Write a protein that binds this ligand. Structure first.
Ligand SMILES: [Mg+2]
Ligand SMILES: [Mg+2]
Ligand SMILES: [Mg+2]
Ligand SMILES: [Mg+2]
Ligand SMILES: [Mg+2]
Ligand SMILES: [Mg+2]
Ligand SMILES: [Mg+2]
Ligand SMILES: [Mg+2]
Ligand SMILES: [Mg+2]
Ligand SMILES: [Mg+2]
Ligand SMILES: [Mg+2]
Ligand SMILES: [Mg+2]
Ligand SMILES: [Mg+2]
Ligand SMILES: [Mg+2]
Ligand SMILES: [Mg+2]
Ligand SMILES: [Mg+2]
Ligand SMILES: [Mg+2]
Ligand SMILES: [Mg+2]
Ligand SMILES: [Mg+2]
Ligand SMILES: [Mg+2]
Ligand SMILES: [Mg+2]
Ligand SMILES: [Mg+2]
Ligand SMILES: [Mg+2]
Ligand SMILES: [Mg+2]
Ligand SMILES: [Mg+2]
Ligand SMILES: [Mg+2]
Ligand SMILES: [Mg+2]
Ligand SMILES: [Mg+2]
Ligand SMILES: [Mg+2]
Ligand SMILES: [Mg+2]
Ligand SMILES: [Mg+2]
Ligand SMILES: [Mg+2]
Ligand SMILES: [Mg+2]
Ligand SMILES: [Mg+2]
Ligand SMILES: [Mg+2]
Ligand SMILES: [Mg+2]
Ligand SMILES: [Mg+2]
Ligand SMILES: [Mg+2]
Ligand SMILES: [Mg+2]
Ligand SMILES: [Mg+2]
Ligand SMILES: [Mg+2]
Ligand SMILES: [Mg+2]
Ligand SMILES: [Mg+2]
Ligand SMILES: [Mg+2]
Ligand SMILES: [Mg+2]
Ligand SMILES: [Mg+2]
Ligand SMILES: [Mg+2]
Ligand SMILES: [Mg+2]
Ligand SMILES: [Mg+2]
Ligand SMILES: [Mg+2]
Ligand SMILES: [Mg+2]
Ligand SMILES: [Mg+2]
Ligand SMILES: [Mg+2]
Ligand SMILES: [Mg+2]
Ligand SMILES: [Mg+2]
Ligand SMILES: [Mg+2]
Ligand SMILES: [Mg+2]
Ligand SMILES: [Mg+2]
Ligand SMILES: [Mg+2]
Ligand SMILES: [Mg+2]
Ligand SMILES: [Mg+2]
Ligand SMILES: [Mg+2]
Ligand SMILES: [Mg+2]
Ligand SMILES: [Mg+2]
Lengths: 120, 56, 52, 122
RNA sequence: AGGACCGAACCGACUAAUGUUGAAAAAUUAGCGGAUGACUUGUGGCUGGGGGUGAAAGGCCAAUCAAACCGGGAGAUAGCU
RNA sequence: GCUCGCCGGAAGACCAAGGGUUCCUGUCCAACGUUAAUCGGGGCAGGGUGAGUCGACCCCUAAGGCGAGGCCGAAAGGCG
RNA sequence: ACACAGGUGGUCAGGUAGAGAAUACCAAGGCGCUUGAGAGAACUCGGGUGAAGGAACUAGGCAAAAUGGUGCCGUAACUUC
RNA sequence: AAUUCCUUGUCGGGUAAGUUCCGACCUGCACGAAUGGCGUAAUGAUGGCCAGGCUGUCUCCACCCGAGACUCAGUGAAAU
RNA sequence: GCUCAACGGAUAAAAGGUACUCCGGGGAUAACAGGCUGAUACCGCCCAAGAGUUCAUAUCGACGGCGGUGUUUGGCACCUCGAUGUCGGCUCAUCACAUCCUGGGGCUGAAGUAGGUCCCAAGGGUAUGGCUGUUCGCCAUUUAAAGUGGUACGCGAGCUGGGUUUAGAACGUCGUGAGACAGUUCGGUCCCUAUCUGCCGUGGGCGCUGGAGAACUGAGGGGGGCUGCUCCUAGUACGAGAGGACCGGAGUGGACGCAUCACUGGUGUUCGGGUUGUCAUGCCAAUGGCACUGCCCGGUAGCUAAAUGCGGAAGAGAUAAGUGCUGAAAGCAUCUAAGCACGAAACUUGCCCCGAGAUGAGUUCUCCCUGACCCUUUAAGGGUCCUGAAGGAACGUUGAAGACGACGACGUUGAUAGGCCGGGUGUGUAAGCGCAGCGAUGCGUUGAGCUAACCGGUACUAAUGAACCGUGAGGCUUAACCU
């Protein structure tokens, strides 16, 4: 069934998905572009964009809610100072999914998820 | 649940009728380098839609 | 089983191994229990006779 | 959903405390009982000198269901506690005189006219 | 004090499910009994095939037991296939 | 290398038993690993175990084994 | 028989809560189990929750569900006291 | 009755309804006194039965979370 | 000199158990099922005394007879002992009619209601529990009725293992004993990933004659087909009363099926909140991890039921049993022989779904292609260059679609999905700070903060322009109209 049940299970625990998408969102912000499969890319897109949505307004309250998620100040410091200002006027897609190829090991369709505006 | 009589080569081939592989055969040349690749996939060095998207 | 149609007393028998053999025994026991019912109705009218 | 083996309370002045529905009267394979359906119960507990006694089998009508009854507007009158009213087995004629425990307007169907008339509320 | 009580280690193995070309030629998960004793366990010995040992099932004696395994008699015999 | 998750009266850390180089380094990928494999308890070469105080050996001894003569038994051998 | 969910004697064994070597979460230390990536059907297995009823299930309350600690009050028949 | 064939014996109790269960009568097919007879407090992973509680056992399933199943890449069996 | 009496005499001389069993063979020979048969069994019929107040046939039916069925118990060993697994229950059924109910009728010891019996009829429906391992049966309470059987007394490569025929033990009885019991009792491993056939769903290839895109007709087939009660007619007909209709027409339920979340609820480990233990974020504060989601309390979408709608039919054609008209054979009589008219939930349609692989491969509408040269045993041939259309497929973003394919929407000439924004829903008065208080904590800011797939907008991100396949007016014979 799963009629209108937008969320992807990823063959894992729910306690694993909260920590996989926490550490993978963390390495996307520390770096600027990472490499993973599409089904993780289409889903990381659902977690990292609500952070760039969040850090457009700095406050003590917004730092906490951005610290419950991602659980590390370095990502919180990378947010609110870099990304918030760097994606200010744009209202929408703060990241880009880009298909590349496959892995030698398990043949998984991969993609380079990237934050937009990286022509520095 | 085992089997009763041995199947033939005929039955072994008719079953592998639909196991036959299929190629892509219709690639796209990029606007910049023209290196052939898959539709909606980056090149070997980082070109995509006539643009170095790997930025490296 | 031998069930009497007017009365309703049942007479079962499963002693031997043959249906033909259990039939005669169940017919015999039914023959006993039906006649012994007649001996009580003979005494029931006799007891009511003594009550006058 | 009052069905077989359901332990109902009693809601009249007859004597019983706990009854148990043993058959939902009304139809073949009939699963449960509802609003004002007639059911067959047995008495599991009574008051000492009362009218009915333990181990007797008579009819009843459900009055207050824990699942509740739906009104035609999409509203429900969900009570809290299953309860019934004992009846004569041979006629409508409820054996009670003091129907306690407020009942539903959905019983007003001329064969239960005595039930609503003796009822306290609703 | 106790062949006492509840309950881990340790020992044992009653119920259910899974498993039964299994992970495993008897185990696993959730429960369970004993748990200072007629207890359990390490190391080293002793008792042997019509014999050993047995809180006694005809159980156990190297995944084998109403008579172990190996070699020989032996190519036993088979009115049977 | 940075987060995460598991064990923590163990899946941690030492000995005995039993194995026998599986220890470490350089290098290699056919076979072995239930996948790939640059990697490895896999292949090849080299190096590695240093004791008066640890252990054994040694001194003594339990159950028990063997057992000079000896007793007994066709022989073997049994018992001491 | 294997790089096998098995078996294997002795010793050391911290912090917080706790009666405890139970158990939970961590320290030191050691590992993620030598196939993975998607999809999210029936069905199978390990589990969660549930309207009204509450054994009506069934060979049988099998399995689940429930009870569960400390202090105190109170505690029947019968009895070898 | 771990014993009664006939038999679900008969009467009583429990239940709306009780081939089982408890008490009793005695026509004991075919109980019986150390191959012990009759009771008996406690005990029991013991046999049968009842009640309270409690719940998906059931009325009648519904949904959800994980591991297979299903698809793709690698390796690649078996009874027959 | 031998009841060497098993008397062509195996020795001068000899009993039993095996459920601890083992080995070699047998369907040469049993148990389970199938098969042949049909004594018995079950059902129907025939003659008819008698019962029935009178009367044989309303309903029963003695003494006797004749068959059917393959549902009983058996007979025979034909089949299997180099395996055919067994009763009952669960589940899923399916067919037969000797029909339990509903439907249509005759007769009646049928006034009415309610029944008895026989004929036609298989469309659908055809109990829940206490006791037993039991089927059956008894009992309680219903229902319109709680049919009888076949189907390895259907179903263990689907489940259970209670019963029964492994190994333990005991009682009663039998035996000197080992043991034994159509006596009994407590306990006791139920194996297999489906090649084929079959069945349930879903696709690929090719064909359908130029190709492609849509919409239908429609042969064939499947699903569905149940029924109670109350009321009106009328408390009329009938009946001394007591009681109490047919037919026709409304309303309200049960069972079953289809469909759907607007309502009521269930789940809702992607949402919010509370709290215990402990570790960590340098520490307070504030959070995160772990302990089945730690335990809980609620809850969006979706799914789904106990929730909410709907369904069976009416009517028609042709008929069964049956009822009549006209009416001869047979001056009469008579439903039948010619002819005609009524007559059931059964048959064919009507309702709904599948459906042109219906190879008998249909029909209609629309769109697209009307380029040049050689060879040749010159034929619906082969080859080359120039164009490769409509359309399809592939790929991509995904769907209330879905196992995989497929199917539907969209692909910047953009709303398909993610994000963002407004709104809604849910949870509930966040964080920080101020004040009150020794403190936990409360109040104020504030029905705020956070808000999952929900609703309406918006191109910010991703659906890149091309390429790949598919062609170039479509054979032969004949007829009918144009020329
Ligand atoms: Mg997987
Ligand atoms: Mg968790
Ligand atoms: Mg294939
Ligand atoms: Mg224990
Ligand atoms: Mg020997
Ligand atoms: Mg010899
Ligand atoms: Mg522990
Ligand atoms: Mg090396
Ligand atoms: Mg390899
Ligand atoms: Mg090496
Ligand atoms: Mg030195
Ligand atoms: Mg000595
Ligand atoms: Mg000398
Ligand atoms: Mg000597
Ligand atoms: Mg391993
Ligand atoms: Mg191991
Ligand atoms: Mg501790
Ligand atoms: Mg550490
Ligand atoms: Mg699942
Ligand atoms: Mg539960
Ligand atoms: Mg239990
Ligand atoms: Mg539990
Ligand atoms: Mg009795
Ligand atoms: Mg005696
Ligand atoms: Mg005795
Ligand atoms: Mg004696
Ligand atoms: Mg004794
Ligand atoms: Mg006692
Ligand atoms: Mg004991
Ligand atoms: Mg009971
Ligand atoms: Mg594969
Ligand atoms: Mg002789
Ligand atoms: Mg025995
Ligand atoms: Mg044999
Ligand atoms: Mg036979
Ligand atoms: Mg007469
Ligand atoms: Mg006769
Ligand atoms: Mg037959
Ligand atoms: Mg037969
Ligand atoms: Mg013969
Ligand atoms: Mg046969
Ligand atoms: Mg009549
Ligand atoms: Mg039952
Ligand atoms: Mg029954
Ligand atoms: Mg069966
Ligand atoms: Mg078992
Ligand atoms: Mg048709
Ligand atoms: Mg039809
Ligand atoms: Mg009149
Ligand atoms: Mg009436
Ligand atoms: Mg709700
Ligand atoms: Mg919840
Ligand atoms: Mg939460
Ligand atoms: Mg704190
Ligand atoms: Mg941690
Ligand atoms: Mg708990
Ligand atoms: Mg809820
Ligand atoms: Mg043709
Ligand atoms: Mg297309
Ligand atoms: Mg627009
Ligand atoms: Mg969207
Ligand atoms: Mg506040
Ligand atoms: Mg909070
Ligand atoms: Mg929001």
């Amino acid at each position: 069934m799963r009629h209108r049940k937008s969320g992807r299970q990823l063959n894992r625990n729910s306690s694993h998905r909260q920590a996989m998408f926490r550490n993978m969102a963390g390495s996307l912000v520390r770096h600027e572009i990472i490499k993973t499969t599409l089904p993780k890319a289409k889903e990381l897109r659902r977690v990292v964009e609500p952070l760039i949505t969040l850090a457009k307004t700095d406050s003590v309250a917004n730092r906490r809610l951005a610290f419950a998620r991602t659980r590390d100040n370095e990502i919180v410091a990378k947010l609110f100072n870099e990304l918030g200002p760097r994606f200010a006027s744009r209202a929408g897609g703060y990241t880009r999914i880009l298909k590349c190829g496959f892995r030698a090991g398990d043949n998984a369709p991969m993609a380079y998820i990237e934050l937009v505006d990286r022509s520095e | 649940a085992v089997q009763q009589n041995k199947p033939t080569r005929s039955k072994r081939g008719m079953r592998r009728s639909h196991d036959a592989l299929t190629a892509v055969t219709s690639l796209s040349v990029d606007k910049t380098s023209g290196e052939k690749h898959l539709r909606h996939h980056i090149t070997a060095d980082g070109y995509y839609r006539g643009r170095k998207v790997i930025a490296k | 089983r031998i069930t009497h149609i007017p009365t309703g007393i049942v007479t079962q028998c499963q002693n031997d191994r043959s249906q033909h053999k259990n039939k005669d025994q169940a017919m015999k026991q039914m023959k006993a229990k039906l006649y012994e019912l007649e001996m009580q109705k003979k005494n029931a009218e006799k007891q009511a006779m003594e009550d006058n | 959903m009052i069905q077989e083996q359901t332990m109902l309370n009693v809601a009249d002045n007859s004597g019983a405390r706990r009854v148990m529905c043993i058959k939902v009267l009304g139809g073949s394979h009939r699963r449960y009982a509802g609003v004002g359906d007639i059911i067959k119960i047995t008495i599991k507990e009574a008051i000492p000198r009362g009218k009915v006694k333990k181990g007797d089998v008579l009819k009843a009508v459900v009055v207050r269901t824990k699942k509740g009854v739906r009104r035609p507007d999409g509203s429900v009158i969900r009570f809290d506690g299953n309860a019934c009213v004992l009846l004569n087995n041979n006629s409508e004629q409820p054996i009670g005189t003091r129907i306690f425990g407020p009942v539903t307007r959905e019983l007003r169907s001329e064969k239960f006219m005595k039930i609503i008339s003796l009822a306290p509320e609703v």
